[PDB]
Amino acid sequence: KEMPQPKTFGELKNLPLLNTDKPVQALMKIADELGEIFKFEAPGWVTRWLSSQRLIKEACDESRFDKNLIQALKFVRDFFGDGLITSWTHEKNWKKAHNILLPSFSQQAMKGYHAMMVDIAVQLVQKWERLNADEHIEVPEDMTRLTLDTIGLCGFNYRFNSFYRDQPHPFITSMVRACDEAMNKLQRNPDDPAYDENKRQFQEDIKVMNDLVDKIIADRKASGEQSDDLLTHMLNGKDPETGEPLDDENIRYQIITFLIAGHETTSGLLSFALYFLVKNPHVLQKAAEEAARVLVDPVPSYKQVKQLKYVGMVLNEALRLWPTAPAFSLYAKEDTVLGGEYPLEKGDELMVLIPQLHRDKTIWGDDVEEFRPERFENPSAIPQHAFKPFGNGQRACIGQQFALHEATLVLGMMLKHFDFEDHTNYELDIKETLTLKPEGFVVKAKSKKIPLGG
Ligand code: HEM
Ligand SMILES: C[C@]12CC[C@H]3[C@@H](CCC4=CC(=O)CC[C@@]43C)[C@@H]1CC[C@@H]2O
């Protein structure tokens, strides 16, 4: 059997089809046309895109497939090194870092992070209480302020102070400018001297990111207070399987890795959640009644956040529709056959298209486009490998609980303290970098004038 494949363009193959700002959304349309699996090929690489739970469930068998880092994106590996997201499972520093950092995401870790999450969430709420009547909120912008600050403080006892800035922190601006520059070069005569300033600017941006990391470490060595946080574990934690802590080189990569991965997809999630709420007033009202019922104190306790059941369903359902890291990659460990129809040679690449997996009518029913948090009412009824916003198996998201606790806390406080109005009747416009975010999403928030504790 031939595997489906969209149209080719000489020896550019399918590559011209990604001549777009929204390639993941373009790939979803192709998935709609061609079905559960299709080959997609470019000059320097080939892969197969999977969209059905039946094939993805096989792809997620770790005895047969492991995590792949895509060659086309080596600029990422360049910058994040052998940090946890950009290391191969077989690499030494993957397992070492994994075992050293897992305890930083334990239940006792989360309880320890809670008060500092609240510190940043109170800042977000206060910003919004202080807006004049004529004004509105820039939602992804403010969610990015919250998430960057929350990972900075909880993780590294460093304050980005993003709510004290009108534009994004220099780290974000440099991050976005670096990772944009690197991505544009994929289709560059890249060595043309016309691009020299592009390369000089790229250098300046890595130097901002690197100075920040240095400050974080230096502040920590100098510190007078006791921290037991993510950075504490990076510095001092020892690999049980061998007794050594990470070296300085790898630690630097973990810091940059956690600063970035630890904020971006969480800001997207909050933004999409708020979008879906304001487009679904009955759901908003239900989420709001919960918030008001559960958050009875002036600030939320860890336990109260665990009781926001419906807010958690809201978040899972936003991650169903628009998983903010929308794809991951796998390779075949040995020759094997997928779905009893598609032969694969050792090393062959697969891509999981998460948003399309999440619209598999076989699994979810026909109403896959509706925003229905009630689907997660009973979470053990969702088949295995049907819902994968946090990836797979031993290479699944280490920060998953951190992300959901932060998001639930913040969304709960937002819904306690304000009524939200989609005052422009916003039309969803999804911007794609390596993640997904609504662009230009704005709302008004009318305060309920509920005082906010310290
Ligand atoms: C809604 C929020 C988030 C989503 C949707 C998300 C998604 C993902 C996905 C899909 C992967 C697997 C990548 C792959 O297969 O190539 C992953 C891995 C990872 N995430 Fe997240 N993530 C989120 C939040 C966070 C947070 C808050 C942190 C850190 C505090 C974090 C740190 C990581 C790390 C370190 C990995 C690599 C795990 C390993 O291989 O050892 N993420 N995430
Ligand atoms: C984009 C991202 C950093 C880089 C990750 C991405 C998801 C998975 C992934 C696979 C790769 O092969 C390169 C690195 C990437 C592309 C991460 C999820 C959140 C973070 O912002």
Ligand SMILES: C[C@]12CC[C@H]3[C@@H](CCC4=CC(=O)CC[C@@]43C)[C@@H]1CC[C@@H]2O
């Ligand atoms: C989906 C993705 C963004 C879109 C990427 C995709 C890898 C394949 C690819 C190559 C490109 O050069 C741009 C578009 C795409 C199609 C990326 C893998 C992780 C990231 O989230």
Ligand SMILES: [Cl-]
């Ligand atoms: Cl509150």
